[PDB]
Symmetry: C3
Subunit: 480 residues, 3 copies
């Protein structure tokens, strides 16, 4: 349940209410370390089958370290940020001398530790893979300085399992130029990520939201490769901070609104263009025009403020009265009376124009409604699909309450003779100004062409003097 939808016949637009916000407002970065036992390329040449599997698996280990070494060497009008600017900024700190040793010394006896860097930022540091101890204690002593021996075959399988994670990380960074998203299992496992969330400087509400939407947290996180230095692989994990949680959100759907009475392509159209996600935020409204950068899990909407606009609350007035005087509502105009459909949360908006067939069908009953020329709406209660032309759209089967708000389509208030049908992105006031301006020039020019009757024309230019008499020019010499 939980969802309600309002359809406005007057503006061919629908609003779905009942969603809860989870907006990413900031970032939080932690450094992930992997201890290494580097070089020791002195191969002992005992050609036993188990020894060459360990050695050829040791090469994969050497290649993984070298690969990572070579690495450290209304959609418009929005803002343009840098998503990994915060995470790249801490990779710059790890390049300084002694900083790697600072975190290496703090992780001497524990897997997790907070390290204060020279930049004045205390960063969480932890270690996920300990290949240094397994190689130098369970493999190399049996191999390097004890006459080249591998006793059991399980040590081969055990070594390729502990090495597998290092190979996948190098493999994932190599095909993403050192920056990966989403944060994969190999970069950070589920238990590790749950542990990191539990230790972040965030609220209990933020910890609870992240721990129950880990898969969404991954899609909004980055992994940034920093340095391979002093037998340590360090990469930064950039986690999202949801500073705005549990505020109401609603999505606006729009569809073309045209006249159905003019002849052929003489019909005019208008469409609201401010579609996307809206959420209350700090007395204002955040607008997310690109619906693709928002993830919806049940009634919870995960959006990024980097792809948002701050708007005043008066923007909601466009839903109920598009001609309001507190906010100028954005629209676009055209003459293309083409049919289309928009699938909403719990219904469908259908714009039927021309000879196009537009219907709404049911899996057990068949076609249950044939739309007439105009912009109509239907909910998912009883309907399962909608057809417009040769396009079959399935309808979301989420249960909710739909409200049909009747009203006169606003396109009928405009005269097609003076209607600017070439506005890609205008507004109500701009359309009114363009009509006021053109009708003023027509009115003013006609008032001048009629106000030039009764004025005297030029007299003959023949070197003679002329006086005025009976509406004509007469020679002055005639009167003397």
């Amino acid at each position: 349940q939980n969802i309600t939808e309002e359809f406005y016949q007057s503006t061919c637009s629908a609003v779905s209410r009942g969603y809860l916000s989870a907006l990413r407002t900031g970032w939080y970065t932690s450094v992930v370390t992997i201890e290494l036992s580097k070089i020791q390329k002195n191969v002992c040449k005992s050609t036993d089958s188990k020894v060459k599997l360990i050695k050829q698996e040791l090469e994969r280990y050497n290649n993984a370290v070298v690969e990572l070494q070579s690495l450290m060497q209304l959609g418009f009008l929005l803002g343009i940020g840098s998503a990994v600017a915060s995470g790249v900024a801490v990779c710059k700190v790890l390049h300084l001398e002694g900083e790697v040793n600072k975190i290496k010394n703090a992780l001497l006896s524990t897997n997790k530790a907070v390290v204060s860097l020279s930049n004045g930022v205390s960063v969480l540091t932890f270690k996920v893979l300990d290949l240094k101890n397994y190689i130098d204690k369970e493999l190399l002593p049996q191999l390097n300085n004890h006459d080249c021996r591998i006793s059991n075959i399980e040590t081969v399988i055990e070594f390729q399992q502990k090495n597998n994670r290092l190979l996948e990380i190098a493999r994932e960074f190599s095909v993403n130029a050192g920056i990966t998203t989403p944060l994969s299992t190999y970069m950070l496992t589920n238990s590790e990520l749950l542990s990191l969330i539990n230790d972040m400087p965030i609220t209990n509400d933020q910890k609870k939201l992240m721990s129950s939407n880990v898969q969404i947290v991954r899609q909004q996180s980055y992994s940034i490769m920093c340095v391979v230095k002093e037998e340590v692989i360090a990469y930064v994990v950039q986690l999202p901070i949801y500073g705005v949680i549990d505020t109401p959100c609603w999505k606006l759907h729009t569809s073309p609104l045209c006249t159905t009475d003019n002849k052929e392509g003489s019909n005019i159209c208008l469409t609201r263009t401010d579609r996307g996600w809206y959420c209350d935020n700090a007395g204002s409204v955040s607008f997310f025009p690109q619906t693709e950068t928002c993830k919806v899990q049940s009634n919870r909407v995960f959006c990024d403020t980097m792809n948002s606009l701050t708007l005043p609350t008066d923007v909601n007035l466009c839903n109920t009265d598009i001609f309001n005087t507190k906010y100028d509502c954005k629209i676009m105009t055209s003459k293309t009376d083409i049919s289309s459909s928009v699938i909403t949360s719990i219904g469908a908006i259908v714009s039927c124009y021309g000879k196009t067939k537009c219907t709404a069908s049911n899996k057990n009953r068949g076609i249950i409604k044939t739309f007439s020329n105009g912009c109509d709406y239907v909910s998912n209660k009883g309907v399962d699909t909608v057809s417009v032309g040769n396009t079959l759209y399935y309808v979301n089967k989420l249960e909710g309450k739909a409200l049909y708000i009747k009203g006169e389509p606003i396109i009928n208030y405009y005269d097609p003779l003076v209607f600017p049908s070439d506005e890609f992105d205008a507004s109500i006031a701009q359309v009114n100004a363009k009509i006021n301006q053109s009708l003023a020039f027509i009115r003013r020019s006609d008032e001048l062409l009629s106000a030039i009757g009764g004025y005297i024309p030029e007299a003959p230019r023949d070197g003679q003097a002329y006086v005025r008499k009976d509406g004509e020019w007469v020679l002055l010499s005639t009167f003397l």
Copy 2:
């Protein structure tokens, strides 16, 4: 097969013909189940290596079922659908009481069966993995209860292969929020997909088309995670239904058409904006403006009707007569005099404007044609690359038949003084309408200048009498 291409010099456009349709018109959903053995939260914990490897593999099995458990908790005037709405509606029914048991009982004796759900929808279900059997029969008995013996090392290797597909399925769903596309081979293998196509309620032509294009079917398919209930993982696979097959298709290529005789930046430009794929469909024409949403295999075109517009058959007149009165062909206008090229199916359109070098080369003979200012066309016969400015274009090496259709460029019909060169998405009639209102804006000024000529200004005010002589006021006393 035999692809032909006609280049229309009059509109700087080309139409590639000879293609056959394969239009996705609907969806087919099926339920995929994986039988699980219930989690033994803490099995034996020995120090034997083979038991250790088995123990670590059981943990990965447990982590995969937990990660899936926490998971169930001209294209701007197109319609907006919900491509996954049909599959998600099936996931809803599976959450209901006993619906998972209804399929679990229907799949005890067969790897596949049709199940009638409470929603009245009969869906095809099938069992895809054999893990509950391999564990409880060959691995768990010699390890559960009060035992801890892993006999052969082959059971360690065999369990890794059995369990690998499950880890990979859980791995994809975790980094995709439970909705993946394309349909990977872990979600459905090649032999399982061929088996599901052979059992779909479709004709033999449709089964044959899907079978020889399994790669494309995956590109237009989805995998949707539903539930983890009663020791079985159920997810839905959403398969495409190609209801329109073997109808002719053609592709339209367009390029800027500018004058070359005007001076500096006074040249006017025009461009057809209806690029994309067209296919006959139920007495109408389906238009796909986003070429990236279509896939081409030999002479077959796989498009999705969701990203299409349903147009009348009269839209074809825009290739033979762009000024026809039956259909208003879409164009855009501009002033920019810049060069570009359009790689077509068996040739290349070149728009050379300004002081830019435009070239057609052969890899063995070098430059073989230097284009002049204007819009020209060249086929791939003896041509390997095209060069426009600083960009090198490779041409397609598909053999075909190219027909050059001579004709006057329609940009020469327009007077530059009244040409509206700022239309982002207009049409032929909309430009003529703006030309009409611009000419009326000129003849209005010509009707006021012809109505003021000959009128006389006021004579000097100085207490003297003035007559009219030679277009000037002369004192009356001068003639006394």
Copy 3:
């Protein structure tokens, strides 16, 4: 690497300079091969644990081979190319009789060989996996004709590792319809790709650039599945050729520029539309509007000319005098008085409008500057974050040298009463022509209102002669 940046207050734009070019000019095609040991179902029925593992792994081998067989059978005005046209043409030649044998013979004695195809092109050829020798010499002897025995368990692990690369190649090709990008390490490992780079027909400077930026090469390369015939799997790897290196490059950032003097939506807005990358190339300027099609690695900028426009050197005049007469600078107009921010290389542009709170902060001192209404700029020296409304932007901490160039906002030169705020993609000269047509209609109408106020009305019609005196008609007979 000295990176500098100038902020142009007049146009609300910044230009970051100091980068070096690496432009993808052409393509290079190489053929990668897998030697197969096709193909036997003759599986002897000895049910040994080690033999059954080889049976299952042999079936996976057979499945991958069969799975690959079914595979063989401002940016809206840019040009349209075929990105893999050159790679597909090489696949075409590999279908010809004997072409695969030519490659297979060239690879009998070496893993890398140059082969001359029948179309004249000499192509590097790489054999990356030799499963034919391993199966027929190490595995099949003791099975096919030696009474069905698997001796050691190391041949089970060794064959699984060798077959692993073939499986991943088939899986990656199966979910990408035989065309993949970026180039994964399964299709080409780091050393194999390096081996191909340094044997290409390119200079040493191009070899060094690609060799030290292997991860970028993968992001700009394609793998194309060609053929599976004569026990060989062949796919073409299409690699970039960087024909233009080390030339200067600069990026342009633009932000909306609005008046702040009017009330509510009475203000007008202007924005430069030519944001993106620019580089010098052969005496012109290559422009890359889609910033996502360029990759930056420290000082270097890797762009693709296919997504570029070749512009004259006069385009730089838009940065110094946007009202120049040589090059017409493109802009867009609106009435949207909305706030946003653009993060640049070493700073941040802030467009603050309305009642929005705009702020630049430091991690140690908090807010250090509060922007006022208008378009302002701040550098990363001392600034870590910028807040515009409810959005937080982290700034890039790259050390550089920023220059603030004071200048009058060009949005102030326009009269809002005649300003066309409905231009999605116009230019300085195009909007001056629309203003010129409205101002000439206002200039002429006022030149007539004052001209009719000085015209003389008709004299009395009473058969008497009149002369003009003191602005009145008086009788000529009075002066007799």
